[PDB]
Structure formats: C-alpha cells, structure tokens
Amino acid sequence: EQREIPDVSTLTYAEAVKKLTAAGFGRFKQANSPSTPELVGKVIGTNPPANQTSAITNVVIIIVGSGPATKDIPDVAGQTVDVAQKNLNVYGFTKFSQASVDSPRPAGEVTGTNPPAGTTVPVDSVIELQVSKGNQFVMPDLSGMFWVDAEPRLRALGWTGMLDKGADVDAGGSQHNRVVYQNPPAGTGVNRDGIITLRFGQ
C-alpha cells in the first residue's frame, strides 16, 4: 500500500517514529543536519519529505538537527587586528568586538581572544579581540649590574619611567654599586612609564 508521509518536523526522533508507524511505515534511518539551536535533537524533515506519498515497504529517512555549524577558533595571537580578522573570516567568522589591553606586544597586535583559541563556537557568533596597547616592556634581570649599564638597557627596552632607588644593601664588597634587589621582578610586563625600584650594594 502507498501512503502519504505525515509531517514529523520539530518532533523528537522517537515520537516521529511513532507517528510514522501509526501511518503504517516501519523502516527508518536517522540522518543529521545543522539546524537552529531550538531544533537540536529534533526532526527537521524526512525523505521522502512531509506530505509526499510513498510505499510503506520503503525506508523513511528521519533527519535530525544537530545545531548551528561550529568551528574551532584559530590562534591569532601576535597578528594585527586587520590580519587577525581576515584570517578569522576564512573560517566564517564575521562578527568582532575589540578591547585594549596592557601588553609588551607591539601596539595593534592581538594578545588573545574571547572565547579563546581552541574553543568550539558557532560560525555566526561574536568573537572578542584583546588588542595590545604596546605600552609595556618585559622586565629584565638586573642582578649584579651597575646603573651606568642598567639604565641604557632599560631605555632601549622602551622604559621612560623613573628610578626609585632604595637604601643600599650591606651585601659585601663584591656587590658594591651592583643591583641586589629589584622591582618589579624579571619577566613581568612593565608599563613604559612605570616606576622601577632598585637597591644597590654599598
């Protein structure tokens, strides 16, 4: 017997089977398609489609939504905003928001994204970009250095700030006029105009 396929869209797979079964069909398969967030795990259509007449001895493909198309956010750190967005475009992302962040990276370079790289997000979702101010430098280790060598090394790194010389530290003759303690610690990101505290040996 031929019979018109009932519309089972928006239903769950199980309930779609029951309705198709009540119509006299008995052989089904599940296929998957991208869909709206509401239709996740829901039937979006069939093959043969709704209201199409068909034999009940034939298979009825029940197509179930899997939600919006997604993609892993690529890493764009170090890239300029212009380059990063175009590289994000090739993945399908077109919506962006930006915020300035304190960073030793050159001004304009992306430091990271929100959601971060490696995150799976919908293609039509918004990706926030953290953009370096280029206002920082990486603090070097100044241990054992004389100030006549220490200062130009800092100036070359972009430091335009002021020295806060603390009291001398009794650390022996081998440390005379040498940096014993420093702040901020080596490796930390330091604002260009930031205050550097040094304590030299007597």
Side-chain angles (χ1 to χ4, degrees), residues 2-37:
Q2 292 289 115
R3 246 173 284 183
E4 196 195 331
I5 291 187
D7 186 24
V8 296
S9 50
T10 69
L11 302 189
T12 65
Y13 182 82
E15 198 65 31
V17 167
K18 307 216 303 256
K19 197 169 187 298
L20 288 167
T21 294
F25 299 87
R27 302 179 62 241
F28 321 101
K29 282 181 54 185
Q30 166 167 339
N32 296 279
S33 293
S35 65
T36 62

PDB file of all heavy atoms in Angstrom, residues 2-37:
ATOM      1  N   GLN A   2       0.438   2.239  -0.796  1.00  0.00           N
ATOM      2  CA  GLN A   2       1.089   3.536  -0.776  1.00  0.00           C
ATOM      3  C   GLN A   2       0.456   4.302   0.380  1.00  0.00           C
ATOM      4  O   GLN A   2      -0.694   4.018   0.754  1.00  0.00           O
ATOM      5  CB  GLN A   2       0.902   4.292  -2.084  1.00  0.00           C
ATOM      6  CG  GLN A   2       1.621   3.677  -3.300  1.00  0.00           C
ATOM      7  CD  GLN A   2       3.123   3.835  -3.228  1.00  0.00           C
ATOM      8  OE1 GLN A   2       3.857   2.853  -3.120  1.00  0.00           O
ATOM      9  NE2 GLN A   2       3.593   5.077  -3.296  1.00  0.00           N
ATOM     10  N   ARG A   3       1.202   5.237   0.975  1.00  0.00           N
ATOM     11  CA  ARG A   3       0.619   6.183   1.940  1.00  0.00           C
ATOM     12  C   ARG A   3       1.373   7.508   2.059  1.00  0.00           C
ATOM     13  O   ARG A   3       2.601   7.555   1.953  1.00  0.00           O
ATOM     14  CB  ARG A   3       0.484   5.511   3.322  1.00  0.00           C
ATOM     15  CG  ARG A   3      -0.990   5.327   3.745  1.00  0.00           C
ATOM     16  CD  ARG A   3      -1.181   4.514   5.019  1.00  0.00           C
ATOM     17  NE  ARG A   3      -1.005   3.077   4.816  1.00  0.00           N
ATOM     18  CZ  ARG A   3      -1.180   2.163   5.768  1.00  0.00           C
ATOM     19  NH1 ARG A   3      -1.535   2.537   6.990  1.00  0.00           N
ATOM     20  NH2 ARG A   3      -0.998   0.876   5.501  1.00  0.00           N
ATOM     21  N   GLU A   4       0.612   8.573   2.302  1.00  0.00           N
ATOM     22  CA  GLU A   4       1.179   9.908   2.424  1.00  0.00           C
ATOM     23  C   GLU A   4       1.954  10.044   3.727  1.00  0.00           C
ATOM     24  O   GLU A   4       1.430   9.753   4.805  1.00  0.00           O
ATOM     25  CB  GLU A   4       0.081  10.975   2.349  1.00  0.00           C
ATOM     26  CG  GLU A   4       0.588  12.370   2.081  1.00  0.00           C
ATOM     27  CD  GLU A   4      -0.441  13.439   2.370  1.00  0.00           C
ATOM     28  OE1 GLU A   4      -1.649  13.159   2.246  1.00  0.00           O
ATOM     29  OE2 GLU A   4      -0.034  14.561   2.732  1.00  0.00           O
ATOM     30  N   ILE A   5       3.210  10.457   3.618  1.00  0.00           N
ATOM     31  CA  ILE A   5       4.060  10.613   4.785  1.00  0.00           C
ATOM     32  C   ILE A   5       3.601  11.789   5.642  1.00  0.00           C
ATOM     33  O   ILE A   5       3.497  12.913   5.156  1.00  0.00           O
ATOM     34  CB  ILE A   5       5.525  10.808   4.375  1.00  0.00           C
ATOM     35  CG1 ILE A   5       6.080   9.512   3.777  1.00  0.00           C
ATOM     36  CG2 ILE A   5       6.359  11.238   5.569  1.00  0.00           C
ATOM     37  CD1 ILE A   5       7.564   9.545   3.503  1.00  0.00           C
ATOM     38  N   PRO A   6       3.323  11.524   6.927  1.00  0.00           N
ATOM     39  CA  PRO A   6       2.920  12.569   7.872  1.00  0.00           C
ATOM     40  C   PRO A   6       4.074  13.510   8.204  1.00  0.00           C
ATOM     41  O   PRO A   6       5.233  13.101   8.141  1.00  0.00           O
ATOM     42  CB  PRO A   6       2.489  11.776   9.106  1.00  0.00           C
ATOM     43  CG  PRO A   6       3.277  10.514   9.025  1.00  0.00           C
ATOM     44  CD  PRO A   6       3.365  10.194   7.560  1.00  0.00           C
ATOM     45  N   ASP A   7       3.757  14.752   8.552  1.00  0.00           N
ATOM     46  CA  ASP A   7       4.781  15.722   8.924  1.00  0.00           C
ATOM     47  C   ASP A   7       5.231  15.489  10.362  1.00  0.00           C
ATOM     48  O   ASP A   7       4.431  15.569  11.293  1.00  0.00           O
ATOM     49  CB  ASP A   7       4.262  17.151   8.748  1.00  0.00           C
ATOM     50  CG  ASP A   7       5.339  18.197   8.977  1.00  0.00           C
ATOM     51  OD1 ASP A   7       6.535  17.866   8.831  1.00  0.00           O
ATOM     52  OD2 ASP A   7       4.989  19.351   9.302  1.00  0.00           O
ATOM     53  N   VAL A   8       6.515  15.198  10.538  1.00  0.00           N
ATOM     54  CA  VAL A   8       7.046  14.883  11.858  1.00  0.00           C
ATOM     55  C   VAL A   8       8.144  15.853  12.281  1.00  0.00           C
ATOM     56  O   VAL A   8       8.908  15.572  13.204  1.00  0.00           O
ATOM     57  CB  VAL A   8       7.601  13.448  11.910  1.00  0.00           C
ATOM     58  CG1 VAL A   8       6.481  12.442  11.700  1.00  0.00           C
ATOM     59  CG2 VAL A   8       8.689  13.264  10.868  1.00  0.00           C
ATOM     60  N   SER A   9       8.217  16.995  11.606  1.00  0.00           N
ATOM     61  CA  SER A   9       9.199  18.017  11.947  1.00  0.00           C
ATOM     62  C   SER A   9       8.949  18.566  13.352  1.00  0.00           C
ATOM     63  O   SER A   9       7.821  18.525  13.847  1.00  0.00           O
ATOM     64  CB  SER A   9       9.177  19.148  10.916  1.00  0.00           C
ATOM     65  OG  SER A   9       7.858  19.613  10.690  1.00  0.00           O
ATOM     66  N   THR A  10      10.020  19.057  13.978  1.00  0.00           N
ATOM     67  CA  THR A  10      10.035  19.588  15.351  1.00  0.00           C
ATOM     68  C   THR A  10       9.842  18.515  16.431  1.00  0.00           C
ATOM     69  O   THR A  10      10.015  18.792  17.617  1.00  0.00           O
ATOM     70  CB  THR A  10       8.965  20.693  15.573  1.00  0.00           C
ATOM     71  OG1 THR A  10       7.653  20.116  15.536  1.00  0.00           O
ATOM     72  CG2 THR A  10       9.081  21.784  14.515  1.00  0.00           C
ATOM     73  N   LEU A  11       9.491  17.298  16.028  1.00  0.00           N
ATOM     74  CA  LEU A  11       9.339  16.204  16.983  1.00  0.00           C
ATOM     75  C   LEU A  11      10.688  15.578  17.315  1.00  0.00           C
ATOM     76  O   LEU A  11      11.664  15.776  16.595  1.00  0.00           O
ATOM     77  CB  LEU A  11       8.397  15.129  16.435  1.00  0.00           C
ATOM     78  CG  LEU A  11       6.973  15.544  16.068  1.00  0.00           C
ATOM     79  CD1 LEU A  11       6.130  14.315  15.752  1.00  0.00           C
ATOM     80  CD2 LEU A  11       6.348  16.364  17.182  1.00  0.00           C
ATOM     81  N   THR A  12      10.738  14.826  18.410  1.00  0.00           N
ATOM     82  CA  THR A  12      11.913  14.021  18.718  1.00  0.00           C
ATOM     83  C   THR A  12      11.930  12.820  17.785  1.00  0.00           C
ATOM     84  O   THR A  12      10.914  12.499  17.168  1.00  0.00           O
ATOM     85  CB  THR A  12      11.925  13.539  20.179  1.00  0.00           C
ATOM     86  OG1 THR A  12      10.832  12.638  20.394  1.00  0.00           O
ATOM     87  CG2 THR A  12      11.811  14.716  21.136  1.00  0.00           C
ATOM     88  N   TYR A  13      13.077  12.155  17.686  1.00  0.00           N
ATOM     89  CA  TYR A  13      13.209  11.003  16.800  1.00  0.00           C
ATOM     90  C   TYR A  13      12.221   9.900  17.173  1.00  0.00           C
ATOM     91  O   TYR A  13      11.557   9.334  16.306  1.00  0.00           O
ATOM     92  CB  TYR A  13      14.639  10.457  16.826  1.00  0.00           C
ATOM     93  CG  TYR A  13      14.855   9.290  15.889  1.00  0.00           C
ATOM     94  CD1 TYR A  13      15.098   9.497  14.539  1.00  0.00           C
ATOM     95  CD2 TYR A  13      14.810   7.981  16.354  1.00  0.00           C
ATOM     96  CE1 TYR A  13      15.293   8.435  13.676  1.00  0.00           C
ATOM     97  CE2 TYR A  13      15.003   6.911  15.498  1.00  0.00           C
ATOM     98  CZ  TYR A  13      15.244   7.144  14.160  1.00  0.00           C
ATOM     99  OH  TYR A  13      15.437   6.085  13.303  1.00  0.00           O
ATOM    100  N   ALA A  14      12.124   9.608  18.466  1.00  0.00           N
ATOM    101  CA  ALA A  14      11.227   8.563  18.948  1.00  0.00           C
ATOM    102  C   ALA A  14       9.775   8.865  18.589  1.00  0.00           C
ATOM    103  O   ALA A  14       9.081   8.020  18.026  1.00  0.00           O
ATOM    104  CB  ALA A  14      11.374   8.392  20.453  1.00  0.00           C
ATOM    105  N   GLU A  15       9.324  10.074  18.904  1.00  0.00           N
ATOM    106  CA  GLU A  15       7.935  10.448  18.670  1.00  0.00           C
ATOM    107  C   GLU A  15       7.629  10.554  17.178  1.00  0.00           C
ATOM    108  O   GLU A  15       6.490  10.356  16.753  1.00  0.00           O
ATOM    109  CB  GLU A  15       7.608  11.766  19.373  1.00  0.00           C
ATOM    110  CG  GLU A  15       6.121  12.007  19.552  1.00  0.00           C
ATOM    111  CD  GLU A  15       5.470  11.004  20.486  1.00  0.00           C
ATOM    112  OE1 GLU A  15       6.150  10.519  21.416  1.00  0.00           O
ATOM    113  OE2 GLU A  15       4.274  10.699  20.290  1.00  0.00           O
ATOM    114  N   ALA A  16       8.648  10.863  16.384  1.00  0.00           N
ATOM    115  CA  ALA A  16       8.496  10.898  14.936  1.00  0.00           C
ATOM    116  C   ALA A  16       8.274   9.489  14.397  1.00  0.00           C
ATOM    117  O   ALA A  16       7.452   9.275  13.507  1.00  0.00           O
ATOM    118  CB  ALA A  16       9.711  11.533  14.285  1.00  0.00           C
ATOM    119  N   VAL A  17       9.017   8.533  14.947  1.00  0.00           N
ATOM    120  CA  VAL A  17       8.870   7.130  14.581  1.00  0.00           C
ATOM    121  C   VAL A  17       7.459   6.634  14.886  1.00  0.00           C
ATOM    122  O   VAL A  17       6.846   5.949  14.067  1.00  0.00           O
ATOM    123  CB  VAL A  17       9.899   6.244  15.320  1.00  0.00           C
ATOM    124  CG1 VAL A  17       9.544   4.771  15.185  1.00  0.00           C
ATOM    125  CG2 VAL A  17      11.302   6.508  14.795  1.00  0.00           C
ATOM    126  N   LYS A  18       6.944   6.998  16.058  1.00  0.00           N
ATOM    127  CA  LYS A  18       5.614   6.570  16.481  1.00  0.00           C
ATOM    128  C   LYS A  18       4.531   7.069  15.531  1.00  0.00           C
ATOM    129  O   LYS A  18       3.609   6.330  15.186  1.00  0.00           O
ATOM    130  CB  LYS A  18       5.316   7.053  17.903  1.00  0.00           C
ATOM    131  CG  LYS A  18       6.370   6.674  18.928  1.00  0.00           C
ATOM    132  CD  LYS A  18       5.744   6.342  20.270  1.00  0.00           C
ATOM    133  CE  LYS A  18       4.903   7.487  20.815  1.00  0.00           C
ATOM    134  NZ  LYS A  18       5.597   8.208  21.917  1.00  0.00           N
ATOM    135  N   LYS A  19       4.646   8.325  15.110  1.00  0.00           N
ATOM    136  CA  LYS A  19       3.667   8.915  14.207  1.00  0.00           C
ATOM    137  C   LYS A  19       3.765   8.280  12.822  1.00  0.00           C
ATOM    138  O   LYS A  19       2.750   7.991  12.188  1.00  0.00           O
ATOM    139  CB  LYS A  19       3.863  10.431  14.119  1.00  0.00           C
ATOM    140  CG  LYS A  19       2.668  11.182  13.554  1.00  0.00           C
ATOM    141  CD  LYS A  19       2.819  12.682  13.753  1.00  0.00           C
ATOM    142  CE  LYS A  19       1.556  13.428  13.347  1.00  0.00           C
ATOM    143  NZ  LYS A  19       1.238  13.250  11.904  1.00  0.00           N
ATOM    144  N   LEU A  20       4.991   8.059  12.360  1.00  0.00           N
ATOM    145  CA  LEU A  20       5.219   7.394  11.083  1.00  0.00           C
ATOM    146  C   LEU A  20       4.726   5.951  11.129  1.00  0.00           C
ATOM    147  O   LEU A  20       4.210   5.428  10.142  1.00  0.00           O
ATOM    148  CB  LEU A  20       6.702   7.433  10.709  1.00  0.00           C
ATOM    149  CG  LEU A  20       7.278   8.782  10.277  1.00  0.00           C
ATOM    150  CD1 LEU A  20       8.799   8.732  10.238  1.00  0.00           C
ATOM    151  CD2 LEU A  20       6.714   9.200   8.927  1.00  0.00           C
ATOM    152  N   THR A  21       4.888   5.316  12.286  1.00  0.00           N
ATOM    153  CA  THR A  21       4.430   3.946  12.484  1.00  0.00           C
ATOM    154  C   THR A  21       2.907   3.873  12.457  1.00  0.00           C
ATOM    155  O   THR A  21       2.328   2.968  11.853  1.00  0.00           O
ATOM    156  CB  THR A  21       4.951   3.369  13.814  1.00  0.00           C
ATOM    157  OG1 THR A  21       6.377   3.238  13.751  1.00  0.00           O
ATOM    158  CG2 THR A  21       4.338   2.006  14.088  1.00  0.00           C
ATOM    159  N   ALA A  22       2.264   4.840  13.106  1.00  0.00           N
ATOM    160  CA  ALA A  22       0.808   4.925  13.115  1.00  0.00           C
ATOM    161  C   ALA A  22       0.271   5.111  11.699  1.00  0.00           C
ATOM    162  O   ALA A  22      -0.851   4.710  11.390  1.00  0.00           O
ATOM    163  CB  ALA A  22       0.346   6.061  14.013  1.00  0.00           C
ATOM    164  N   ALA A  23       1.086   5.718  10.840  1.00  0.00           N
ATOM    165  CA  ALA A  23       0.730   5.896   9.439  1.00  0.00           C
ATOM    166  C   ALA A  23       1.015   4.634   8.628  1.00  0.00           C
ATOM    167  O   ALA A  23       0.707   4.572   7.444  1.00  0.00           O
ATOM    168  CB  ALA A  23       1.476   7.083   8.849  1.00  0.00           C
ATOM    169  N   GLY A  24       1.616   3.632   9.264  1.00  0.00           N
ATOM    170  CA  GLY A  24       1.818   2.346   8.618  1.00  0.00           C
ATOM    171  C   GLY A  24       3.227   2.059   8.130  1.00  0.00           C
ATOM    172  O   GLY A  24       3.478   1.006   7.545  1.00  0.00           O
ATOM    173  N   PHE A  25       4.149   2.989   8.362  1.00  0.00           N
ATOM    174  CA  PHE A  25       5.545   2.777   7.991  1.00  0.00           C
ATOM    175  C   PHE A  25       6.259   2.011   9.103  1.00  0.00           C
ATOM    176  O   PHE A  25       5.769   1.950  10.229  1.00  0.00           O
ATOM    177  CB  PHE A  25       6.239   4.112   7.711  1.00  0.00           C
ATOM    178  CG  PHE A  25       5.630   4.883   6.570  1.00  0.00           C
ATOM    179  CD1 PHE A  25       4.568   5.746   6.787  1.00  0.00           C
ATOM    180  CD2 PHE A  25       6.116   4.739   5.279  1.00  0.00           C
ATOM    181  CE1 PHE A  25       4.003   6.453   5.741  1.00  0.00           C
ATOM    182  CE2 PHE A  25       5.556   5.444   4.229  1.00  0.00           C
ATOM    183  CZ  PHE A  25       4.497   6.302   4.461  1.00  0.00           C
ATOM    184  N   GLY A  26       7.410   1.421   8.790  1.00  0.00           N
ATOM    185  CA  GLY A  26       8.098   0.584   9.757  1.00  0.00           C
ATOM    186  C   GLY A  26       9.614   0.555   9.675  1.00  0.00           C
ATOM    187  O   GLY A  26      10.274   0.055  10.586  1.00  0.00           O
ATOM    188  N   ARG A  27      10.173   1.087   8.593  1.00  0.00           N
ATOM    189  CA  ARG A  27      11.623   1.078   8.414  1.00  0.00           C
ATOM    190  C   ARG A  27      12.182   2.496   8.333  1.00  0.00           C
ATOM    191  O   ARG A  27      11.863   3.250   7.412  1.00  0.00           O
ATOM    192  CB  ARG A  27      11.996   0.275   7.165  1.00  0.00           C
ATOM    193  CG  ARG A  27      11.499  -1.164   7.212  1.00  0.00           C
ATOM    194  CD  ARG A  27      11.853  -1.948   5.956  1.00  0.00           C
ATOM    195  NE  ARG A  27      13.295  -2.060   5.763  1.00  0.00           N
ATOM    196  CZ  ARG A  27      13.945  -1.578   4.709  1.00  0.00           C
ATOM    197  NH1 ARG A  27      13.278  -0.959   3.746  1.00  0.00           N
ATOM    198  NH2 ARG A  27      15.259  -1.725   4.613  1.00  0.00           N
ATOM    199  N   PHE A  28      13.022   2.849   9.303  1.00  0.00           N
ATOM    200  CA  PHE A  28      13.533   4.211   9.423  1.00  0.00           C
ATOM    201  C   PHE A  28      15.046   4.271   9.592  1.00  0.00           C
ATOM    202  O   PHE A  28      15.672   3.322  10.065  1.00  0.00           O
ATOM    203  CB  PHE A  28      12.872   4.921  10.607  1.00  0.00           C
ATOM    204  CG  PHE A  28      11.417   4.600  10.771  1.00  0.00           C
ATOM    205  CD1 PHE A  28      11.002   3.681  11.720  1.00  0.00           C
ATOM    206  CD2 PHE A  28      10.465   5.219   9.981  1.00  0.00           C
ATOM    207  CE1 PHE A  28       9.663   3.382  11.874  1.00  0.00           C
ATOM    208  CE2 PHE A  28       9.125   4.924  10.130  1.00  0.00           C
ATOM    209  CZ  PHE A  28       8.723   4.006  11.079  1.00  0.00           C
ATOM    210  N   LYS A  29      15.621   5.405   9.203  1.00  0.00           N
ATOM    211  CA  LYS A  29      17.032   5.693   9.428  1.00  0.00           C
ATOM    212  C   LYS A  29      17.185   7.131   9.901  1.00  0.00           C
ATOM    213  O   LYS A  29      16.396   7.998   9.525  1.00  0.00           O
ATOM    214  CB  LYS A  29      17.853   5.473   8.157  1.00  0.00           C
ATOM    215  CG  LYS A  29      18.162   4.024   7.830  1.00  0.00           C
ATOM    216  CD  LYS A  29      18.997   3.926   6.561  1.00  0.00           C
ATOM    217  CE  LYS A  29      20.244   4.794   6.652  1.00  0.00           C
ATOM    218  NZ  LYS A  29      21.017   4.808   5.378  1.00  0.00           N
ATOM    219  N   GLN A  30      18.194   7.389  10.725  1.00  0.00           N
ATOM    220  CA  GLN A  30      18.464   8.755  11.156  1.00  0.00           C
ATOM    221  C   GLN A  30      19.614   9.373  10.372  1.00  0.00           C
ATOM    222  O   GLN A  30      20.695   8.793  10.264  1.00  0.00           O
ATOM    223  CB  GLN A  30      18.778   8.816  12.652  1.00  0.00           C
ATOM    224  CG  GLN A  30      19.388  10.150  13.076  1.00  0.00           C
ATOM    225  CD  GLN A  30      19.421  10.346  14.579  1.00  0.00           C
ATOM    226  OE1 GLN A  30      18.675   9.708  15.318  1.00  0.00           O
ATOM    227  NE2 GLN A  30      20.293  11.238  15.038  1.00  0.00           N
ATOM    228  N   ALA A  31      19.363  10.553   9.816  1.00  0.00           N
ATOM    229  CA  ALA A  31      20.415  11.371   9.234  1.00  0.00           C
ATOM    230  C   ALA A  31      20.537  12.651  10.051  1.00  0.00           C
ATOM    231  O   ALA A  31      19.609  13.019  10.773  1.00  0.00           O
ATOM    232  CB  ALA A  31      20.122  11.680   7.777  1.00  0.00           C
ATOM    233  N   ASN A  32      21.674  13.326   9.949  1.00  0.00           N
ATOM    234  CA  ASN A  32      21.890  14.531  10.740  1.00  0.00           C
ATOM    235  C   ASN A  32      22.202  15.750   9.882  1.00  0.00           C
ATOM    236  O   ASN A  32      22.934  15.662   8.897  1.00  0.00           O
ATOM    237  CB  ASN A  32      23.011  14.300  11.756  1.00  0.00           C
ATOM    238  CG  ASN A  32      22.660  13.228  12.772  1.00  0.00           C
ATOM    239  OD1 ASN A  32      21.948  13.486  13.743  1.00  0.00           O
ATOM    240  ND2 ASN A  32      23.159  12.018  12.551  1.00  0.00           N
ATOM    241  N   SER A  33      21.627  16.885  10.268  1.00  0.00           N
ATOM    242  CA  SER A  33      21.821  18.145   9.561  1.00  0.00           C
ATOM    243  C   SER A  33      21.990  19.295  10.548  1.00  0.00           C
ATOM    244  O   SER A  33      21.411  19.269  11.634  1.00  0.00           O
ATOM    245  CB  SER A  33      20.640  18.430   8.628  1.00  0.00           C
ATOM    246  OG  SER A  33      20.589  17.503   7.558  1.00  0.00           O
ATOM    247  N   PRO A  34      22.788  20.307  10.175  1.00  0.00           N
ATOM    248  CA  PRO A  34      22.883  21.513  11.001  1.00  0.00           C
ATOM    249  C   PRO A  34      21.540  22.231  11.055  1.00  0.00           C
ATOM    250  O   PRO A  34      20.801  22.214  10.071  1.00  0.00           O
ATOM    251  CB  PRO A  34      23.939  22.356  10.280  1.00  0.00           C
ATOM    252  CG  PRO A  34      23.923  21.861   8.873  1.00  0.00           C
ATOM    253  CD  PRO A  34      23.633  20.394   8.972  1.00  0.00           C
ATOM    254  N   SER A  35      21.225  22.845  12.190  1.00  0.00           N
ATOM    255  CA  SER A  35      19.926  23.480  12.362  1.00  0.00           C
ATOM    256  C   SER A  35      19.979  24.641  13.346  1.00  0.00           C
ATOM    257  O   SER A  35      21.047  25.013  13.831  1.00  0.00           O
ATOM    258  CB  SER A  35      18.894  22.453  12.835  1.00  0.00           C
ATOM    259  OG  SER A  35      19.226  21.963  14.122  1.00  0.00           O
ATOM    260  N   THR A  36      18.813  25.211  13.629  1.00  0.00           N
ATOM    261  CA  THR A  36      18.686  26.245  14.647  1.00  0.00           C
ATOM    262  C   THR A  36      18.902  25.617  16.023  1.00  0.00           C
ATOM    263  O   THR A  36      18.727  24.410  16.183  1.00  0.00           O
ATOM    264  CB  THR A  36      17.305  26.925  14.582  1.00  0.00           C
ATOM    265  OG1 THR A  36      16.280  25.958  14.836  1.00  0.00           O
ATOM    266  CG2 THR A  36      17.083  27.545  13.211  1.00  0.00           C
ATOM    267  N   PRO A  37      19.305  26.427  17.017  1.00  0.00           N
ATOM    268  CA  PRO A  37      19.553  25.908  18.368  1.00  0.00           C
ATOM    269  C   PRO A  37      18.345  25.217  19.007  1.00  0.00           C
ATOM    270  O   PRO A  37      18.523  24.324  19.835  1.00  0.00           O
ATOM    271  CB  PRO A  37      19.930  27.166  19.155  1.00  0.00           C
ATOM    272  CG  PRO A  37      20.525  28.070  18.135  1.00  0.00           C
ATOM    273  CD  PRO A  37      19.723  27.835  16.887  1.00  0.00           C
TER     274      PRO A  37
END
